[PDB]
């Protein structure tokens, strides 16, 4: 039960990529749509965080390291990968628990840090988003 603005922020993202013609989204590719997602983005607001700072190094980061589909053939479309997946699959069932009826994007920021290694969370950390200030205003909202 994804919320209009996770499904709008999730739809951004794959048209995101078919314009630059990545073949993949990762995490990454994930987390910089849910800079524009309303949910997500009053959480980052609410812990002080620099989004514009973020927004770059994170848009940096996925320019040098995603691959561009060659002017050849097949394809076409990009692929979500294993970590843009679990992150997914780990916020919807995160809800489905004892809790709401819809997944926000909110939720899905939460999952990110779960996947530990990612660039994803080595920025939020670097940016100092705190977790645990993420996980209570959510608790205490909605």
Same mark, same amino acid.
């Given at each position: 039960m994804l919320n209009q603005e996770l499904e709008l922020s999730l739809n951004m993202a794959f048209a995101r990529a078919r314009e630059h013609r990545h073949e993949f989204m990762t995490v990454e590719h994930l987390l910089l749509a849910l800079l524009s997602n309303p949910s997500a983005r009053e959480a980052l607001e609410a812990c002080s965080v620099d989004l514009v700072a973020l927004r770059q190094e994170l848009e940096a980061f996925i320019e040098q390291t995603t691959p561009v589909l060659p002017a050849? +053939? +097949? +394809?076409?479309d990009t692929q979500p990968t294993l970590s843009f997946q679990r992150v997914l699959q780990r916020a919807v069932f995160h809800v489905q628990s004892s809790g709401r009826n819809e997944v926000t994007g909110a939720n899905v920021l939460v999952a990110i840090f779960s996947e530990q290694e990612s660039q994803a969370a080595y920025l939020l950390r670097k940016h100092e988003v705190s977790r645990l200030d993420v996980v209570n205003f959510i608790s205490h909202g909605t």
């Open positions: 050849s +053939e +097949e +394809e076409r």
